[PDB]
Write a protein that binds this ligand. Sequence first.
Ligand SMILES: CC(=O)N[C@@H]1[C@@H](O)[C@@H](O)[C@@H](CO)O[C@@H]1O
Length: 137
Amino acid sequence: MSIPAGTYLIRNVESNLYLDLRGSNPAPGTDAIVWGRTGNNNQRWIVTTHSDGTRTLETVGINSSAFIATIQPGGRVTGHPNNETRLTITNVNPGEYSISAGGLLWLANTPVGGTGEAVTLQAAGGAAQSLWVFEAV
Ligand SMILES: CC(=O)N[C@@H]1[C@@H](O)[C@@H](O)[C@@H](CO)O[C@@H]1O
């Protein structure tokens, strides 16, 4: 009930937008946003699996992972060259998954006013309001 290891493109099903790194900056504190499909190196994510059943995402080329400093109901998702975060990617529908970090689900946060917004954690409600599709590249 989890995605296998490998390189994928993650797409949000609620708005048909792809997970992207803002500006391709290889610096700490770079927001992970949702943006239109371009297929560049900042939109391809390598999924690596661990022993306990958790998986991590790394950007291709830039080599910036997905790092959440404080796992709280309202924290953002950023990119760090060294530090990482162990995610849980479970299956709710055939084809559509859901990603959580420390028990809190993710959120879409579609861009408003021509500016992307960082993916933010969701409060403990248990209802997956955002599902992701892992298209093989
Ligand atoms: C090629 C490239 O880096 N594209 C990025 C895009 O991914 C997105 O981050 C945008 C932010 O508004 O800034 C650039 O256009």
